[PDB]
Paper text:
The [name] [name] protein transits from pole-to-pole within the cell, accumulating at the pole that defines the direction of movement in social (S) motility. The N-terminal receiver domain (RD), a 258-residue coiled-coil domain, and the extreme C-terminal tail of the protein are all required for the dynamic subcellular localization and S-motility activity of [name]. Here we show using atomic-resolution crystallography and NMR that the [name] receiver domain (RD) displays the conserved switch Tyr102 in an unusual conformation, lacks the conserved Asp phosphorylation site, and fails to bind Mg2+ or the phosphoryl analogue, Mg2+·BeF3. The crystal structures of the mutants suggested that the observed conformation of Tyr102 in the wild-type [name] RD is not sufficient for function. These results support the model that [name] contains a novel ‘pseudo-receiver domain’ whose function requires recognition of the RD output face but not Asp phosphorylation.
The hexagonal form was solved by molecular replacement using the first RD from the diguanylate cyclase PleD as the search model. The R/R-free values for all data to 1.0 Å resolution were 9.2/12.3%, below the average for structures at comparable resolution in the PDB. In the [name] RD, the conserved Tyr102 adopted an ‘inward-facing’ rotamer. In contrast to the CheY structure, we observed no conformational heterogeneity along the α4-β5-α5 face of the 1.0 Å [name] RD structure, even at low contours of electron density below 0.25 σ. In the high-resolution hexagonal structure, a discrete minor population was modelled at 34% occupancy for the side-chain and backbone atoms of residues 55–62. This alternate conformation suggests a coordinated mode of motion, but this segment has not been implicated in dynamic rearrangements associated with RD signalling. The position of Tyr102 in [name] is partially buried, suggesting that apo-[name] does not prevent interactions along the α4-β5-α5 face by steric clashes with the switch tyrosine.
Author numbering: 3 to 124
Write the structure that this text describes.
C-alpha cells in the first residue's frame, strides 16, 4: 500500500512518513504542489496525504479539485491535513476529500484514517 505525502513542511512530512512506514505503508514525499498531479498520474499512489498550506501560497484544496475532476485520478483517496477552519467549506463541494485531519497533526490519527480508507498493510 503506497502513500504520497504532498507537504512542503519537511519536518512534518518526515514525521508522518515515519509513522506510516512503521505501520507498514510504503511512503513517498513531495514538496512540489505544482508538480503533484502529474506525479500522482505517473506513480499512482493508493492514497495521498495533501497539505492545504503548501509552498508559495498554493492552496492544496485546489490540487484536490484537480484530482477529483480528472477521470483517471478522481478515485485516489485524499486525506487533507490543514487548518480545520477550512474543512466545513470544503466538505460541501463536489471535489471534497475523503478524510480531513487537523494541523497540528496527530500522527497516530493519520495512520488510522489511512487504514480506514485503503486498508492496513498485511
Amino acid at each position: 500500500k503506497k502513500i504520497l505525502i504532498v507537504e512542503s513542511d519537511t519536518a512534518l512530512s518526515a514525521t508522518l512518513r515515519s509513522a506510516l512506514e512503521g505501520r507498514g505503508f510504503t511512503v513517498d514525499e513531495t514538496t512540489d504542489g505544482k508538480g503533484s498531479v502529474e506525479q500522482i498520474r505517473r506513480d499512482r499512489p493508493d492514497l495521498v496525504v495533501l497539505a492545504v498550506d503548501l509552498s508559495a501560497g498554493q492552496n492544496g484544496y485546489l490540487i484536490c479539485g484537480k484530482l477529483k475532476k480528472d477521470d483517471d485520478l478522481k478515485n485516489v483517496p485524499i486525506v487533507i491535513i490543514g487548518n480545520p477552519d477550512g474543512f466545513a467549506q470544503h466538505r460541501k463541494l463536489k471535489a471534497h476529500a475523503d478524510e480531513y485531519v487537523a494541523k497540528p497533526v496527530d500522527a497516530d490519527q493519520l495512520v488510522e484514517r489511512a487504514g480506514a480508507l485503503i486498508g492496513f498493510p498485511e
